[PDB]
Design a protein around this ligand. Structure first.
Ligand SMILES: Nc1nc2c(ncn2[C@@H]2O[C@H](COP(=O)(O)OP(=O)(O)O)[C@@H](O)[C@H]2O)c(=O)[nH]1
Ligand SMILES: [Mn+2]
Ligand SMILES: [Mn+2]
Ligand SMILES: [Mn+2]
Length: 620
């Protein structure tokens, strides 16, 4: 009911019906409509027509270009200030700070950024009021994971960005069928605005609406709400990805007894007809996608891709660890993707694919550094800065974090069960990062507890995923440092608890290092398709083959255990060297880190593994 005409936004609905919305769905829409004051409200139905008019609108607004060389592929150049995931402006709001991050013994926590409700209410009220003035509010109903799937959760994103709606149509399951499945069930409330209400008081660079100064990505797990403002780029705007699928989901999984992890999922089959499913957690820009879509070099081996970034896992009745990719597409980095590195990626992005900040060729194609592909005579390149670009300038034509957004179904090696609502049984878990020195190519954990300790001890050099720069090695336990939904100590404890479940078929735990270097700065391992040689060893260890040698850090392959045929020139000495001098410093850094950051919430079993490892190393 109302006394005037200031609460019923029906007259602003250009597609859909507020009447057809579930009870709580309508309230969430009209409430923020009244707060944000959008000129129009557009309730997405996921249709091809919608996608069609949507793209055409963005092309008439100078938002995106059409890549005439490919089938239904589009380019989008963003503002140079809004070109990646802002880790420093992401915050989690909990009544108690301890719920979010362990109280550091001395210094600032690196495992999350907490903000009180009082501080957030101020920041919120200073951003969203009237932020969509003169823009359309798109209502994105999307399901994470297959519909009806048990570990499938539904969210509603409100956004004033057509670029976001198009991307979300690729990355999630979006449309009207999601509304009907939801019914009156619960859902995740997602609110996004670029923060440039009209009239534009700030000119737009590359026609990219954004507000860097006021950027803020907030999470409220107690309320099941995600509030993002000022950014339109991937992690910040695609709220169902990082914000939902990891941070909020991790909190839920802790509550509900499953797991939400920053892991690729791949299935692998050997020449004997036996197939196994593995999961790998690497930091961003550390090889997950190239591994999940690997083109193996060992004959009789087949790799299939279930997912490349997010895994939702839970033990089933039979005690197996089951995993699903809750996403619907791939949002991978562009540069370095060549036919020689990730050819399966090339085959996927040639249609229905949206690119961001990659270079455009004068004939209607894409270009980026490392594409490893000569262009024809008379073909010019326009950089992502929208300027004539030549290979003689220092300006790279493709931004380091530039992306492609492609449907998962188009992948030629997509696993025939990536949408199976029952998941895939994970028999192995892989950790790793970019360690230039010290860490051997691969080793196996001595037990679950040691495994959990290995994940927690992961470290890697600074890449181009967040705002980190320089050549520095920092901690990234479980590859989840930027995405922990709650206290990390309680995270570790949650993992260790899996060893207590009845008839729990705990998978093996490996640590790989694709990036060990020599004294000249030369990679000691070709990697990519050759990583199938490392997976071969893992496959045999899962079946119980006496191919492992015991060492102070874990099991490593025996002599002549790794199929190295076709190489011969690989320096195996330095590739597996376990220097005591290096590992005595490694334990010190891990100790100091764990004592400071996890402090009084560090489980004792992790402290015991730390103690045990320090002991085995001193006996060298
Ligand atoms: N040396 C080496 N580099 C790799 C390998 N796989 C990927 N890369 C590089 O890492 C960058 C990002 O890899 P990607 O698979 O997209 O990482 P993701 O973010 O985890 O999906 C690419 O530019 C590649 O050049 C590998 O096996 N060996
Ligand atoms: Mn990721
Ligand atoms: Mn990726
Ligand atoms: Mn225990």
């Amino acid at each position: 009911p109302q006394l005037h005409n200031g609460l019923d936004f029906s007259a602003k609905v250009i597609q859909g019906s507020l009447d057809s919305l579930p009870q709580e769905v309508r309230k969430f829409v009209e409430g923020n409509a009244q707060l944000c004051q959008p000129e129009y409200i557009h309730i997405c139905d996921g249709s091809e027509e919608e996608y069609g008019r949507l793209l055409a609108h963005m092309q008439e607004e100078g938002v995106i270009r059409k890549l005439k060389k490919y089938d239904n592929c589009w380019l989008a150049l963003t503002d140079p200030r809004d070109v990646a995931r802002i880790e420093s402006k992401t915050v989690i709001i909990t009544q108690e700070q301890r719920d979010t991050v362990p109280i550091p013994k001395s210094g600032q926590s690196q495992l999350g950024r907490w903000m009180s409700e009082e501080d957030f209410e101020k920041a919120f009220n200073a951003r969203f009021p009237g932020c969509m003035k003169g823009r359309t509010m798109y209502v994105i109903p999307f399901s994470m994971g297959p519909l009806g799937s048990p570990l499938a959760k539904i969210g509603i994103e409100l956004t004033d960005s057509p670029y976001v709606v198009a991307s979300m149509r690729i990355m999630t399951r979006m449309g009207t069928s999601v509304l009907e499945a939801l019914g009156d069930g619960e859902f995740i409330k997602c609110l996004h605005s670029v923060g440039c209400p009209l009239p534009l008081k700030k000119p737009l660079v590359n026609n990219w609406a954004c507000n860097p100064e006021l950027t803020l990505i907030a999470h409220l797990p107690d309320r099941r709400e995600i509030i993002s403002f000022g950014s339109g780029y991937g992690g910040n705007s695609l709220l169902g990805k990082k914000c939902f699928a990891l941070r909020i989901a991790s909190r839920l999984a802790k509550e509900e007894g499953w797991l939400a992890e920053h892991m690729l999922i791949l299935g692998i089959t050997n020449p004997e007809g036996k197939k196994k499913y593995l999961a790998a957690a690497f930091p961003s820009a550390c090889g997950k996608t190239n591994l999940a879509m690997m083109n193996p070099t060992l004959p009789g081996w087949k790799v299939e891709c279930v997912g490349d970034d997010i895994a939702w896992m839970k033990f089933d009745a039979q005690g197996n660890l089951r995993a699903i990719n809750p996403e619907n597409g791939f949002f991978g980095v562009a540069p370095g993707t060549s036919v020689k590195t990730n050819p399966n990626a090339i085959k996927t992005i040639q249609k229905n694919t949206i690119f961001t900040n990659v270079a455009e060729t004068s004939d209607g194609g894409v270009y980026w550094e490392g594409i490893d592909e000569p262009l024809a005579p008379g073909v010019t390149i326009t950089s992502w800065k929208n300027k004539e670009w030549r290979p003689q300038d220092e300006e790279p034509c493709a931004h380091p974090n530039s992306r492609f957004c492609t449907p998962a179904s188009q992948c030629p090696i997509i696993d025939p069960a990536w949408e199976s609502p029952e998941g895939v049984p994970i028999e192995g878990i892989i950790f790793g990062g970019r360690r230039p020195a010290g860490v051997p190519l691969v080793y196996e954990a001595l037990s679950w507890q040691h495994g959990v300790f290995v994940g927690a001890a992961m470290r890697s050099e600074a890449t181009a995923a967040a705002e980190h720069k320089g050549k520095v090695i920092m901690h990234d336990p479980f590859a989840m440092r930027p995405f922990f939904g709650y206290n990390f100590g309680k995270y570790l404890a949650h993992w260790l608890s899996m060893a207590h479940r009845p008839a729990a078929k705990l998978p093996k735990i490996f640590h790989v290092n694709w990036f060990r270097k020599d004294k000249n700065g030369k990679f000691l391992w070709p990697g990519f398709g050759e990583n199938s040689r490392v997976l071969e060893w893992m496959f045999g260890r899962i079946e119980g083959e006496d191919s492992a040698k015991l060492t102070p850090i874990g099991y490593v392959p025996k002599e002549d255990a790794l199929n190295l045929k076709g190489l011969g020139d690989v320096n195996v000495e330095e590739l597996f060297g376990i220097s005591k001098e290096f590992w005595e410093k490694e334990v010190e850094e891990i100790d100091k880190y764990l004592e400071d950051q996890v402090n009084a919430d560090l489980p004792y079993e992790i402290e015991r593994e730390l103690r045990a490892l320090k002991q085995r190393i001193s006996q060298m």
